[PDB]
């Protein structure tokens, strides 16, 4: 896997293909929920000892693919509609379509808050878009004693345009929150909350054009990479983040 046992890699063309193929694949996935255009699948292994990959698909009848793409890319907007995020920002750029970033979120009070450092890469494929990420180690961002460092084994989005003003988005993730949570508790929780998180994102897409008009509408560095204010990084300055060490 891109998430690797040997070293950090910027996703190549095959990694984008495997990811899309993973989203479109149904064999090896069991349906778990399906109501009002939102469905949730779980990787058909149902061995509750391990961490399961989760897949969530949502039909967006009245938002275009490009708007959903902006919303996934817009780090600044995340704090407007994401009720869990503490801190999120990009750290450095690797290539014109790959960077490294930081994301913190709060967990209910016996649990501690969590953070991730991820390598993210994005690719418009014709009418569709893919954004993927997986966890990585950045020497200036070691774990913090107050936060549990989680590991994103693989997380990403496939946006499929279904015409103007409409699209379908598939979210695929496998995230280990580490800490003290049993893996099967994570599998169940992420399954149970997934449809709610997707519909919150959908509502955000409806409010996005008006919000973005008030917040430098022309500033979209994910579409115009010459606008990026980020420093650059060599791939060898990063280290692999193992799910289990």
UniProtKB/Swiss-Prot annotation:
Domain spans labelled START: 1-210
Keywords for the protein's UniProt record, in alphabetical order: Acetylation, Cell projection, Cilium, Cytoplasm, Flagellum, Lipid transport, Lipid-binding, Membrane, Phosphoprotein, Transport
Gene Ontology CC: cytosol; intercellular canaliculus; membrane; microvillus; motile cilium
Modified residues (Phosphoserine): 239, 245
Predominant subcellular localization, coarse grouping: other
Residues modified to N6-succinyllysine: 80, 183, 188
Keyword Zinc: no
GO MF assignments: lipid binding
Intracellular or extracellular location(s): Cell projection, Cilium, Flagellum; Cytoplasm; Membrane
Protein name: START domain-containing protein 10
Organism: Homo sapiens
Residues of the full protein shown: 15 to 259 of 291
């Amino acid at each position: 896997p891109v998430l690797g046992r040997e070293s950090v890699q910027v996703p190549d063309d095959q990694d984008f293909r495997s990811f899309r193929s993973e989203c479109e694949a149904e064999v090896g996935w069991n349906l778990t929920y399906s109501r009002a255009g939102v469905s949730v699948w779980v990787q058909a292994v149902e061995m509750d000892r391990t961490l399961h990959k989760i897949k969530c698909r949502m039909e967006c009848c009245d938002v275009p693919a490009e708007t959903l793409y902006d919303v996934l890319h817009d780090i600044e907007y995340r704090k407007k509609w994401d009720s869990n995020v503490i801190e999120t920002f990009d750290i450095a750029r690797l290539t014109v379509n790959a960077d490294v970033g930081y994301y913190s979120w709060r967990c209910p009070k016996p649990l501690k808050n969590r953070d991730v450092i991820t390598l993210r890469s994005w690719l418009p494929m014709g009418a569709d878009y893919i954004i993927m990420n997986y966890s990585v180690k950045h020497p200036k961002y070691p774990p913090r004693k107050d936060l549990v460092r989680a590991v994103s084994i693989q997380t990403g989005y496939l946006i499929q345009s279904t015409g103007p003003k409409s699209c379908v988005i598939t979210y695929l993730a496998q995230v280990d929150p580490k800490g003290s949570l049993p893996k099967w508790v994570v599998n169940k929780s992420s399954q149970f909350l997934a449809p709610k998180a997707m519909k919150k994102m959908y509502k955000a897409c409806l409010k996005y054009p008006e919000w973005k008009q008030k917040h430098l509408p022309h500033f979209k560095p994910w579409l115009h990479p010459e606008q990026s204010p980020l420093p650059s990084l060599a791939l060898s300055e990063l280290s692999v983040q193992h799910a289990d060490s």
